[PDB]
């Protein structure tokens, strides 16, 4: 299911930013329907959102240390409305188009 999912604590254009996920988070957007290998962050939100729901990841906390999410962006655990800390652990693992 495409679709896009936007905060108001990140600035419009930089939800955005045209990126290429690295090769393990590109096969985890496609484990959730994702098709194409260029995204807008905002996609990118949309699906990493599906793929929790269905890994059943979700105090507003997400538990991803037993899960390739937790490998990916390096802890244990987040809060879902800390919205930067999350931008920061997922461009981590993609290229910013040129
Ligand atoms: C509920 C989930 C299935 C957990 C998905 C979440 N939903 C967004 C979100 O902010 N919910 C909270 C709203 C306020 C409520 O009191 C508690 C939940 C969040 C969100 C939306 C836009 C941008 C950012 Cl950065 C963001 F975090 C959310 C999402 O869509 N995709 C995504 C990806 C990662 Cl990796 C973590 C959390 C989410």
């Known amino acids: 299911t495409d679709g896009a999912v936007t905060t108001s604590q990140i600035p419009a254009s930089e939800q955005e930013t045209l990126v290429r996920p690295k090769p393990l988070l590109l096969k985890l957007l496609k484990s ?3 098709q ?4 807008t962050m905002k996609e990118v939100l949309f ?3 599906q793929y929790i ?3 059943r990841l ?3 906390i997400v538990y991803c240390s037993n ?3 937790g490998d990916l962006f390096g802890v244990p655990s987040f809060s879902v409305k800390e919205h930067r800390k999350i931008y920061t652990m997922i ?3 993609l290229v910013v188009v040129n």
Do not use: F
């Not at 194409?36 to 995204?39: G, N």
């Open 32 to 34: 959730v329907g994702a």
């Open 91 to 93: 461009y981590r693992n």
């Open 53 to 55: 729901m269905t890994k």
């Open 47 to 49: 699906y990493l959102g």
């Open 67 to 69: 899960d390739l999410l």
């Open 36 to 39: 194409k290998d260029t995204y």
């Open 58 to 60: 979700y105090q507003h």
